[PDB]
Amino acid sequence: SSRKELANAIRALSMDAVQKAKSGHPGAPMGMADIAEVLWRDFLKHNPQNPSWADRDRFVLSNGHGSMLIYSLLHLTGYDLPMEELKNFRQLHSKTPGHPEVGYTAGVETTTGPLGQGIANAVGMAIAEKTLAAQFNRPGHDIVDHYTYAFMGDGCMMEGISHEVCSLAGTLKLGKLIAFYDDNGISIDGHVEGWFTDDTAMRFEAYGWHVIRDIDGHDAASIKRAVEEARAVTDKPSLLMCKTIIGFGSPNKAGTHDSHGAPLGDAEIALTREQLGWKYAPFEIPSEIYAQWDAKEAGQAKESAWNEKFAAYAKAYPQEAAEFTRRMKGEMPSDFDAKAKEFIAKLQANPAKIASRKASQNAIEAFGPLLPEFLGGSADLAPSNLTLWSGSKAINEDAAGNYIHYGVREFGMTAIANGISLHGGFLPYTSTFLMFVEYARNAVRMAALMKQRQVMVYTHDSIGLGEDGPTHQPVEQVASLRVTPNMSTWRPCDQVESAVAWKYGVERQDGPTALILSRQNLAQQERTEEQLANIARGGYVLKDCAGQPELIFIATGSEVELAVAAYEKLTAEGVKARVVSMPSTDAFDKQDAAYRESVLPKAVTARVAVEAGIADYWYKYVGLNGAIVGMTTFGESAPAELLFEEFGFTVDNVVAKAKELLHHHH
Amino acid sequence: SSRKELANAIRALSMDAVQKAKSGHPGAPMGMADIAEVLWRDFLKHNPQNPSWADRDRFVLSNGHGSMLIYSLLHLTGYDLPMEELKNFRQLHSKTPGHPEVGYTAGVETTTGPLGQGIANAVGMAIAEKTLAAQFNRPGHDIVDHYTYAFMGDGCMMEGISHEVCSLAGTLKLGKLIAFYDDNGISIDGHVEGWFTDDTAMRFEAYGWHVIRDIDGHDAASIKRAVEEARAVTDKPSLLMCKTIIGFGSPNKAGTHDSHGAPLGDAEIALTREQLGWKYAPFEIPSEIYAQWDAKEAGQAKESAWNEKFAAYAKAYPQEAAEFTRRMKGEMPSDFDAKAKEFIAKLQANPAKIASRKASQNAIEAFGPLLPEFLGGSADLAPSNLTLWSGSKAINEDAAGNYIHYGVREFGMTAIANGISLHGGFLPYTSTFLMFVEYARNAVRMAALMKQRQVMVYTHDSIGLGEDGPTHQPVEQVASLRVTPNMSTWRPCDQVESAVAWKYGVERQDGPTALILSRQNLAQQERTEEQLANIARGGYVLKDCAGQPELIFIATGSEVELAVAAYEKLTAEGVKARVVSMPSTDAFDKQDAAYRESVLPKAVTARVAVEAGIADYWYKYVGLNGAIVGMTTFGESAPAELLFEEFGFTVDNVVAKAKELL
Ligand SMILES: Cc1ncc(C[n+]2c([C@](O)(CO)[C@@H](O)[C@H](O)[C@H](O)COP(=O)(O)O)sc(CCOP(=O)(O)OP(=O)(O)O)c2C)c(N)n1
Numbered sequence A: 001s002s003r004k005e006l007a008n009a010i011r012a013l014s015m016d017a018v019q020k021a022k023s024g025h026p027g028a029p030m031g032m033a034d035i036a037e038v039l040w041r042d043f044l045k046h047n048p049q050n051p052s053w054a055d056r057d058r059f060v061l062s063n064g065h066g067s068m069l070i071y072s073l074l075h076l077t078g079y080d081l082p083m084e085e086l087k088n089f090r091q092l093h094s095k096t097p098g099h100p101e102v103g104y105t106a107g108v109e110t111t112t113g114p115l116g117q118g119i120a121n122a123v124g125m126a127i128a129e130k131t132l133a134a135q136f137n138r139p140g141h142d143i144v145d146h147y148t149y150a151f152m153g154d155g156c157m158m159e160g161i162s163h164e165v166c167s168l169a170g171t172l173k174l175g176k177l178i179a180f181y182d183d184n185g186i187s188i189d190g191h192v193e194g195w196f197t198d199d200t201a202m203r204f205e206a207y208g209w210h211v212i213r214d215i216d217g218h219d220a221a222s223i224k225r226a227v228e229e230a231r232a233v234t235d236k237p238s239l240l241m242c243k244t245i246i247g248f249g250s251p252n253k254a255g256t257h258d259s260h261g262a263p264l265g266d267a268e269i270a271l272t273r274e275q276l277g278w279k280y281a282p283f284e285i286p287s288e289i290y291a292q293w294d295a296k297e298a299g300q301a302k303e304s305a306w307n308e309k310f311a312a313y314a315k316a317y318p319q320e321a322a323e324f325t326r327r328m329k330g331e332m333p334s335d336f337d338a339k340a341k342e343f344i345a346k347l348q349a350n351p352a353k354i355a356s357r358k359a360s361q362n363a364i365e366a367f368g369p370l371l372p373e374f375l376g377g378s379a380d381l382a383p384s385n386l387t388l389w390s391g392s393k394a395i396n397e398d399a400a401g402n403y404i405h406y407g408v409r410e411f412g413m414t415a416i417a418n419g420i421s422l423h424g425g426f427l428p429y430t431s432t433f434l435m436f437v438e439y440a441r442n443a444v445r446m447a448a449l450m451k452q453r454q455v456m457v458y459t460h461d462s463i464g465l466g467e468d469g470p471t472h473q474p475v476e477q478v479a480s481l482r483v484t485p486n487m488s489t490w491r492p493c494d495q496v497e498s499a500v501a502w503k504y505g506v507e508r509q510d511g512p513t514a515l516i517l518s519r520q521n522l523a524q525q526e527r528t529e530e531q532l533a534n535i536a537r538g539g540y541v542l543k544d545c546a547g548q549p550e551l552i553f554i555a556t557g558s559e560v561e562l563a564v565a566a567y568e569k570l571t572a573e574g575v576k577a578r579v580v581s582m583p584s585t586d587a588f589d590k591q592d593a594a595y596r597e598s599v600l601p602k603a604v605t606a607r608v609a610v611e612a613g614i615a616d617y618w619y620k621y622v623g624l625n626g627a628i629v630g631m632t633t634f635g636e637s638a639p640a641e642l643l644f645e646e647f648g649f650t651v652d653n654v655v656a657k658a659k660e661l662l663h664h665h666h
Numbered sequence B: 001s002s003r004k005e006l007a008n009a010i011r012a013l014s015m016d017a018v019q020k021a022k023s024g025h026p027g028a029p030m031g032m033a034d035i036a037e038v039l040w041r042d043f044l045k046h047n048p049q050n051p052s053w054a055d056r057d058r059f060v061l062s063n064g065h066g067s068m069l070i071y072s073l074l075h076l077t078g079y080d081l082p083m084e085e086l087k088n089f090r091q092l093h094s095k096t097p098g099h100p101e102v103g104y105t106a107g108v109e110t111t112t113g114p115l116g117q118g119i120a121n122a123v124g125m126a127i128a129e130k131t132l133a134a135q136f137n138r139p140g141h142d143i144v145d146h147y148t149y150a151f152m153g154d155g156c157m158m159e160g161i162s163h164e165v166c167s168l169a170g171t172l173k174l175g176k177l178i179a180f181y182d183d184n185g186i187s188i189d190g191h192v193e194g195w196f197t198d199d200t201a202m203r204f205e206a207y208g209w210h211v212i213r214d215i216d217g218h219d220a221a222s223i224k225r226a227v228e229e230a231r232a233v234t235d236k237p238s239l240l241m242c243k244t245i246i247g248f249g250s251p252n253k254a255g256t257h258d259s260h261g262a263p264l265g266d267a268e269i270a271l272t273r274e275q276l277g278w279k280y281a282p283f284e285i286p287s288e289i290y291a292q293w294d295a296k297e298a299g300q301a302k303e304s305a306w307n308e309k310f311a312a313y314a315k316a317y318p319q320e321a322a323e324f325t326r327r328m329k330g331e332m333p334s335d336f337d338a339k340a341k342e343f344i345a346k347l348q349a350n351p352a353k354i355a356s357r358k359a360s361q362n363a364i365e366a367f368g369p370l371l372p373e374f375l376g377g378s379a380d381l382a383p384s385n386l387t388l389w390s391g392s393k394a395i396n397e398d399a400a401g402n403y404i405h406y407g408v409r410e411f412g413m414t415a416i417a418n419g420i421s422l423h424g425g426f427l428p429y430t431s432t433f434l435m436f437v438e439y440a441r442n443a444v445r446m447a448a449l450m451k452q453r454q455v456m457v458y459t460h461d462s463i464g465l466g467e468d469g470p471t472h473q474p475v476e477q478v479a480s481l482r483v484t485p486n487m488s489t490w491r492p493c494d495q496v497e498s499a500v501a502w503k504y505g506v507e508r509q510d511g512p513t514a515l516i517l518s519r520q521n522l523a524q525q526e527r528t529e530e531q532l533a534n535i536a537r538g539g540y541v542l543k544d545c546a547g548q549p550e551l552i553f554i555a556t557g558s559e560v561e562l563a564v565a566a567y568e569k570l571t572a573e574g575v576k577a578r579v580v581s582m583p584s585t586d587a588f589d590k591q592d593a594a595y596r597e598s599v600l601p602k603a604v605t606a607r608v609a610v611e612a613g614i615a616d617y618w619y620k621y622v623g624l625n626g627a628i629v630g631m632t633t634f635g636e637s638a639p640a641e642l643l644f645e646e647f648g649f650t651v652d653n654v655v656a657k658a659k660e661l662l
């Protein structure tokens, strides 16, 4: 078959699958089919029979609406994605969801759909390869050596995140990153010139990318020459400007916004078959075409060669080889649990009244020698977030390092870290002030959706940060995280809860963990062995009374000290009170009914929440007959101690609100 | 006095105020003082005696951590910002908060601090000026003619939002936007080359900006020449690449990250006075320096001249002048309330089952002829969000238009719209799929913080959008808006609640309004006159029983129909059931306690919330002894009907959860 015929197999499967679903996006798959044919058939290093091969090239579809492009490719090349699944495009529990999802489709590297995040993930995967190669490769043993290829369109280019990640990719000289820009002149509103006029080549040259202009995206030879050129440039990421026609093949819809996001229609599909010379019926692919598309034999050969290379590496470098295998699997060191518990016990036994941002730094320092897989960073706030430890080495200085200066790029940082976690080999942590989680907010959600391990270090968590004022002082941000499916959020009240939360985060294999950390010093609380162990259960009894409490305080983070002070005052007056520390609502909610009842007994309705965060959240635990000492407004610019007074975070106010509650109950 | 001495007054005030507060950022104010002296003294058209003058130039400090820069400028040029306020920098309830805040302080145009948003706001202000000029200017009567100047640093340049708004600024040929880049090579982590290596000039030429390279940011002659060149280029926004030294004047901390964000210290301040040759004590400014800085006389002269121009315009164009005044004040047309009510009444009387995204478009169509101040748009989703009406005219085609194709730029769109609302003269609406509010999240918060009127049109609100799947299907986004201070959030259940929500949004004077709209068709509910009037109260009794209810459903948006069906089933069994429609929790919360008690009686604890969004929100209304039929997971890619079934949005499930309570 000709290259065009082979590319037309993608066009057929894509338009037919979309038609059967009566839903989806035929435009981009039809426009990019010739580019995909050259990349996948001539260049991509992969094994359909082992999508987890450590040294495979990584491909990312950043324009993820064109999901049938990737499903066509995976099916044709021989991945475990049968034709039946293509017939179930966009149907419940199929392996072919409307946008591609990592985890339950063989060969899909990341979940896209939110524009711009794919290219960010690709930058992360490229950083991962570069860093892993620098760490593990040895003279005569280049066990890490693979490319990262990304497809992206006008949507991804317009998004601010593309600026963040492509700027950084230039700084880091990611010579194995090669992106293809689907330059088709069309977006949903129509011809893009009304709203998008960048000289995109000049923009990417500004970033230090090697740009290849004016590629005929429908000519295999031209595409192939461009890929070879990009591969020859080893010191810059490459952007291939591929001029394509959206919906290529459709006489009436090619080059129109109409081909972007709806089925072509049966009449138009018939006309498209005729224009393309594609004779086969929907979901029909002949043996001869499978024979040319299939990658099983080449894939086997390439992975076998690599396995031999790795075996020779293991002989010459056994310790390094065992570390590489461990890290690629995402397994923890065998002695980590014991060593981390020893650290936590030491903290409980040796009180220190320090900011939880500092307690976080101390946990990084403690874990650093144990977790060589750390690849951490901050969005230009290293000295404020406290993300550096004694063994940190920035990758812009030494490629075998473990630290990334992300610059002022919260969204890019977080989506890059998603790429890092997806790649394998590393445990990323990222950091900024908690307020600026709002800049990165969808990338945080994407880590949760993709079940990725990433520790998110969010300092300066409340009005306790003081003078910087309401644009910086979080109020409603913690609540936003708490209600996010599969998110874990910890607001530790002292250095001990901080270390427990850090341990929880690094050991959490199936989703991310946000740490909510103070600028100001936090009092250490006394704990029995049982209480110390109970921190990990998310909510636990910290102070108690004999018999049923008349009053339960529920407090988090910096406000536990306040709640304990109120508890002491009320107790001295003969009130039967309890204090529950709730460092993690999500962990608490995951405990069984018996444990939750033991902490927050259903009989006790007089419950007082105390937290320098939005009050409305706390009805979840206090119900309609309790009280909440929280924030209901934005903050103010003033010294922290004056703000806490202003906003009612005082022993006198907490006591008064508790007594007022009890008077109402009585 | 010399220009350098005049600029040094900013340096002294800034380092001294930071020192007194033991908090704040002396670096950028010290680095930008010479640029500020040229801009403010030689070019800026403003009147300190009236910071609200319609035709003033707008200045924006996008690098807002350098707040003492703007406070020094406002004080020195004669605004109502006394020395005592500078001496109370960063102190509770002062007019000098750590980052500048609009409303707090005479002459502050916007609230900055979140990097990147200031330049976005400035792009919005320049869009507003260009559009207002095209709408209102007449031959011989150019009543709108002002510049938008912005200062910005490496942080703003690194942020993605700068790409979004500066790209669009280039497309829109905003020739009266002039930005000064504080090119000082330092950020918090240290020397920027480790993480920031863009050829920023080349980047901005790629956006179609006019770029002036290699300006000596410490040389008045160099700066003045560059501003003149930028003003002469009328068809492109301009970027001035100003090479400066952070903390200029400090022998030991100039050019270091140490000068960015902490007091210099008393010893270093003394050395800085010596290096600068500044001989005045903290908070001492001699009369000769005030004399050269003060702008009261020139400002009053310029504004008076404008007032005379406006009077002549008003003689020739009385209707247009009246509209200009109304729109600049943000006042509504006097008959808008009556006309909108008539529209709402018509919808109730003429039922239609349509998607609330379509009901939204219909409200835009009804209000369009009434609100010429609309400046609306969508982030490349016009045909899906349904933001165009018959009278929409895109400003890239017609400068006097009322519609912006924002492209795929949700964050930039929203912060640009903040600039539009801040400017005066317009009522912006913006739009995207609700999920992608997450891309714009901090700009949405900033609209609320700044008490700005903007209608945020968020369609495709739930699993009801179907096949696009979990990356697109909102679950927890509405809950996050609901708990945002000063945010109004409406999730209308039919075309009638949609129109009421739109009315509420445009009539807000002091904050933004998010509309939570469906992809799929919504049934219209029957309403009495009382119920119809009560939609605007955010929560109301839609279906009821005789006497005290034994069971209350609380439902929103697309789930009201489901709640009504459960209500009918239980009512037929003889349960005393009620349905409350809760289109806006914030509007409901603001009602008097007698009204709230009439809707959700305190004695009735058997409450069932029903909404295709995160369950945890609803404990606020159902407490510990109710039930919630909501989402607790991400969505799935499948047809909407099958998703509602899969996730428990069925009459059987709602009825079963209700029976569990009774
Ligand atoms: C961050 C972000 N923003 C907007 C979008 C939305 N978006 C997208 C979608 O949500 C798909 O992910 C929509 O196509 C959506 O499916 C339909 O509008 C649904 O229509 P309806 O039938 O419900 O009315 S794609 C996109 C603009 C397309 O620009 P491109 O130039 O990237 O697309 P091309 O490959 O040339 O067609 C845009 C703007 C996104 N996916 N991610």
Ligand SMILES: Cc1ncc(C[n+]2c([C@](O)(CO)[C@@H](O)[C@H](O)[C@H](O)COP(=O)(O)O)sc(CCOP(=O)(O)OP(=O)(O)O)c2C)c(N)n1
Residues within 6 Å of the ligand: A379, A380, A381, A383, A384, A385, A408, A436, A439, A460, A468, A519, B027, B028, B063, B064, B065, B066, B113, B114, B115, B116, B153, B154, B155, B156, B182, B184, B186, B187, B188, B246, B260, B261
């Ligand atoms: C969207 C966003 N991201 C990060 C920031 C943070 N930020 C800022 C601050 O939050 C101020 O708004 C911090 O300075 C903050 O006050 C301190 O870190 C507090 O220190 P601590 O005593 O609490 O430890 S500024 C900054 C980047 C600095 O780069 P520039 O090059 O813009 O600053 P320059 O004018 O040259 O000094 C950055 C990175 C922001 N304002 N907005």
Ligand SMILES: [Ca+2]
Residues within 6 Å of the ligand: A153, A154, A155, A182, A184, A185, A186, A187
């Ligand atoms: Ca396109």
Ligand SMILES: [Ca+2]
Residues within 6 Å of the ligand: B153, B154, B155, B182, B184, B185, B186, B187
């Ligand atoms: Ca700087």
